[model samples]
Target: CTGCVDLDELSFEKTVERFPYSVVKFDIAYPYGEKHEAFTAFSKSAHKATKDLLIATVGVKDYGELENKALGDRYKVDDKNFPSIFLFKGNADEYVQLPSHVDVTLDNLKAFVSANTPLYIGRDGCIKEFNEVLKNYANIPDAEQLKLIEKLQAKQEQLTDPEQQQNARAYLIYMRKIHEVGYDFLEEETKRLLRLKAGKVTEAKKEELLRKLNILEVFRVHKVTKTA
Candidate 1:
């Protein structure tokens, strides 16, 4: 429950006010197993992504120690829709739900939030800073492109952790290459890397290429509105 706040009928409205933006999971009175574990894992990553949004939980009691029929009814949450997720942003009364088709997982949940808001929820191996740089890289002026590349170089040097420094190196390399070549280099290079990966490359080298490909993908949902 580190990244979660438990809400009930009494506190639902009141507690939501503390965090203007929130993603709430509406599930049964008792939640356990893999699905619950995935939400719990996502809750932790989401908290790390931004302080503006919070992860919360509300246990809707269909038949529990205490029933919460009205609460579920008010939100249109059916028993079959247990584990439904909703996003509350900017408005107290209005909220949105994650569509039924998307599976609930740490990455998908993060992507869902990102799809709606300015917040960026990166997948595993994706870095927020690198993604930001990539987002603006092609749009900015020619001189700014060089400056951004230089900044990545400076940023890489400043990182004290060996692992983090390694991550920075990936951004730096891609930045320099994209600066020299055009944006199309990413797709072409990705294709090229995939071919190399399939060849008799060492397992270690394959992982290295895969890591770069994962970080490179940062450059690239439904709606349910509650009207009450």
Candidate 2:
């Protein structure tokens, strides 16, 4: 059975415990040994949950790993068959092995967890990595990112062909993923280090500044209906 890491056991609780959630990486050591196959069995049992479950593993081995390593990295669910890191919402009973330091706090953990939600991080961590790199391009600011998103939305509305429209849809998905990753990383990093002295401007500030980031904006997926 997968075990829980009690909140009391963490040494940094005083400094990091106030956050409402946690990221839990599975240990290499287990009473059943390190087969990892156990995670697969355990994962099958978590079809629904009140707390989110995120798993990061290799080659289709875990849910979270698949998103970071395959889906988001290779571009969409069909692009690759590698393991996905499973992010859950509401509740989680199943468990999977988590890589080292993978789980930290809710803001940091939510990206890799909560699949099916509009805003999320997949296995390969592409979205998170993409935004971090965005900081290097000083010429492009967060406002620019928002503007880019608007343009994609505009272009998407203009496309008529199904295939072409799908590409535009993908483009929007990519950008939103990047923004979500950026916001989460910002939230966690600020909590850990206070100020971002690295000249990297993340949209994470107390009260008003956080509102400006707006990473949690609702996504509008185009829905089609058939007449009864």
Candidate 3:
């Protein structure tokens, strides 16, 4: 008989913490293939995080393998000869591409995180900041801060008013679309913002944006909450 294994970041971490010396083994088989295949499990947060994130982002995009060498013939998948981002144990050779093509540029990433005002705030405040990010610079000398403040204050006043709040909710959808577009166009958009469109954006530009985005860092899984 075989024992059960729990998945998810926290469960994986707890298992590794409790069994420091245990070797991880699991099965993965593709369509029309044999079941109960075997593959060694890797320990370490970097290894797990990189693998899980890759699976989440690029489940079957290309040949998916992190720490290819770590696998001992039991792991099998559909694709072959695909690009992989691997981090492994007993092998410094396998790092999460540590500084990858998506998260490396500091200033650009900071600007991106700062630009999405709505993501940080609720619908009303986000609307105010969204306009500010796109329109509040020196070019708009006549823009009034008080005008934006009043709009936001009025929104807060209507927290109890369902109809007005319903209208303001439009920004919520707009914010999601903006975030998606912004993420998709960060490299090109940042280059355009910097006036670096001398020719066109290249792989280097993508890498630069990645550096800015801090792609290598683990995102905060748990958020702080307020007590009612």
| Prediction 1 global C-alpha lDDT | 0.72
Cα error, residue 113 of model 2, in Å, equals 42
Clashes of each: 0, 38, 12
- Which candidate model has the greater TM-score, 1 or 2? 1
- In model 1, what lDDT does residue 24 have? 85
Judging by TM-score against the true structure, name the best candidate. 1
Per-residue CA lDDT of model 2 for 1-228, tens digit only, reads 333332222232331233223333322223133334444333332211223433323222234423223323322322232222333232332223233355333333444344345444332112232333333222244577687678667766886645345444544654665555543433453344334333465443342223222221222113312111
Highest lDDT against the true fold, candidate: 1
Give the lowest summed-lDDT range of ten residues in model 1: 219-228
Which lDDT values do the candidates have, in the order given? 0.72, 0.36, 0.30
RMSD of each: 9.4, 19.7, 18.8
Instruction: Report the lDDT of model 1 for residue 99.
Output: 89
In order of TM-score, best first, we have 1, 2, 3
lDDT of 3 by residue, 98-213 (tens): 22244323232222222421122112122233334333121122233334334545554556545335433443333332333422333443454356434468976654434333
TM-score of each: 0.63, 0.21, 0.18
* lDDT for position 142 in model 1: 66
Q: On TM-score, who's better, 2 or 3?
A: 2
